[PDB]
From a paper:
The protein GspD forms a 15-fold rotationally symmetric pore termed the secretin that inserts into the outer membrane (OM) and provides a conduit for substrate into the external environment. The T2SS from the human pathogen K. pneumoniae HS11286 strain comprises 13 genes in a single unidirectional operon termed PulC through to PulO.
Focused refinement of the OMC yielded a reconstruction with an overall resolution of 4.3 Å. All domains of PulD were resolved with sufficient map quality to build a complete model of the monomer and the secretin, excluding the amino acids (aa) in loops 288–303, 462–470 and 632–637. The N1, N2 and N3 domains pack tightly with a diagonal offset of 36°. N0 is positioned almost directly below the N1 domain and does not maintain the diagonal offset. The N-terminus of loop 7 forms a wedge that packs between neighbouring N1 domains. The N0 domains form a tightly packed ring with alternating stacked β-sheets sandwiched between helices 2 and 4. Importantly, each PulC HR domain binds to only a single PulD N0 domain and has no contact with neighbouring PulC HR domains. Overall, the binding of the PulC HR domain to the PulD N0 domain appears to be important for the correct positioning of the N0 domain within the secretin and the subsequent stabilisation of the N1 and N2 domains. Loop 38 between S-domain helix 14 and helix 15 bound to PulS constitutes the lone contact point between the secretin core and PulS.
Author numbering:
A (entry chain B): 354 to 404
B (entry chain A): 405 to 461, 474 to 505
C (entry chain B): 455 to 461, 474 to 631, 638 to 652
D (entry chain R): 39 to 131
E (entry chain C): 506 to 606
């Protein structure tokens, strides 16, 4: 038997800092690159993080 | 940036800039191993648990686990002798 | 099953190899230099370097013991937990537990394990003593067999007709039919 | 398959119950006629077509002879039946 | 037998060779059903995962768990039975009857 748990948040602001956590499975890099690429292209492009 | 961890705060007032950088990290690990066995005195018993994996020495079989073996000799009414050897790998 | 490794290679077996040597000493006592292992292969993901692909999870026991005739006997045992924790937080922060909980980042996991070995012999002298051992044990089989799916079975039933030892086979059958 | 299995099942329980009474010391069981009436009552409770009592008697006799001539040890027969004619007994009491 | 639905063949030797192998010695009466060897075994495993703190109301929260359960049961039985045969007469019954079987 094996049990496991995790928990964590992250923050971002153009004028402010950056709170990243890689253990989580997804950086903010996934986000800043997800939405500016999204709304730049209009929609999803496979260039985004395959994670 | 794909690997960074922690915080850093962006500031700009004209010509200057500054970046604060810090993080705290910790890690904790525990283990426990309780094997038990019976045998007669003079004959040796041996015991082991764990997987087995081959190295390239064309190669041979290699075991990784908890190989606990002993040799019990009962002497007095109550006393024993234990030439034990083992490893947790 | 049996699977070959590259040592050009040879035959390798993975299963439950239980072998022993029984010595009857007293009126009732026995001696068992038993050895065995329950092995399997997992290979969710493991170290295969395009060489020999194998994990061969195994547990292997061997020893000698004196045991009375009809007796439950503890031979070998293992029980173990394993915990690990991972934390990281911006320094000086997260310190107010109710409030600051918004800056920690936590990953915790555990693993527990246990293993137990038991053996039990029985002496058998002659035909009579044999019938109970076989018949009863066979019933222990049919218990789980017929436990879920209720099917009629040519082999099993007929074999029972063997273990029994023509009219009685008719009337007992009919009674059985009736009580469905 | 319509009137034959019903007769065989009732004849079998009546013959085995008589065996138990006569040969396996089941002195709590009633007389042969009462055992025959109880087997008829099992058929009636199941909604079975009326089974002739005398046809049941004749069949049951034949099955009783088969139980008697069987080369099965008595001890085994008595144990087997006693555990087979268990529900039946309950119904007849 | 050989199964090989999917197995470890590394372009070397392709084989599984499922097997069960018995050997022993026994004393047995002439016409007798005899239990030689036996195995019976079940094997269960479970897999669960859910967003924490949720799924806790069984009737309601059942909408967040994700469940995969499976079992395997197994049993194996061995029986032997000899018969002695002295002469022609004893032979006829054994052959004829068996052939009828």
């Amino acid at each position: 038997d094996a049990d496991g748990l995790n928990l964590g948040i992250q923050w971002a602001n153009k004028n402010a800092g950056m709170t990243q956590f890689t253990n989580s499975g997804l950086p903010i890099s996934t986000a800043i690159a997800g939405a500016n690429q999204y709304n730049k292209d209009g929609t999803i492009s496979s260039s985004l993080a395959s994670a | 940036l794909g690997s960074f961890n922690g915080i850093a705060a962006g500031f700009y007032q004209g010509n200057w800039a500054m970046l604060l950088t810090a993080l705290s990290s910790s890690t904790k690990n525990d283990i426990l191993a309780t094997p038990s066995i019976v045998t007669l005195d003079n004959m040796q018993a041996t015991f082991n648990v764990g997987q087995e994996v081959p190295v390239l020495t064309t190669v041979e079989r290699k075991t990784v686990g908890i190989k606990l073996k002993v040799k019990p000799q009962i002497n007095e009414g109550d006393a024993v002798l234990l030439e034990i050897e083992q490893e947790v790998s | 099953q049996e699977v070959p490794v590259l040592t050009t290679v040879e035959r390798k077996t993975v299963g439950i190899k239980l072998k022993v040597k029984p010595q009857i000493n007293e009126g009732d006592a026995v001696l068992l230099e038993i050895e065995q292992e329950v092995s399997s292969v997992a290979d969710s993901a493991s170290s295969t370097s395009s060489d020999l692909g194998a994990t061969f999870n195994t547990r292997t026991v061997n020893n000698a013991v004196l045991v009375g005739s009809g007796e439950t006997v503890v031979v070998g045992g293992l029980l173990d937990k394993t915990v690990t924790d991972t934390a990281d937080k911006v320094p000086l922060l997260g310190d107010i537990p109710v409030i600051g909980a918004l800056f920690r980042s936590d990953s915790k996991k555990v693993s527990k394990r246990n293993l137990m070995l038991f053996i039990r012999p029985t002496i058998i002298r002659d035909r009579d003593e044999y019938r109970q051992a076989s018949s009863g044990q066979y019933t222990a089989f049919n218990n789980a067999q017929t436990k879920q799916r209720g099917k009629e079975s040519s082999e099993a039933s007929l074999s029972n007709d063997l273990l029994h030892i023509q009219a009685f086979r008719q009337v007992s059958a009919a009674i059985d039919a009736f009580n469905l | 398959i319509s009137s034959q299995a019903q007769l065989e099942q009732l004849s079998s329980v009546a013959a085995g119950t008589r065996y138990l009474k006569n040969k396996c010391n089941r002195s709590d069981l009633p007389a042969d006629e009462t055992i025959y009436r109880a087997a008829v009552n099992v058929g009636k409770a199941r909604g079975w077509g009326n089974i002739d009592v005398a046809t049941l008697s004749q069949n049951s006799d034949r099955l009783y002879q088969q139980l008697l001539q069987d080369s099965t040890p008595e001890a085994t027969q008595c144990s087997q039946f006693n555990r087979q004619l268990a529900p039946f007994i309950a119904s007849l009491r």
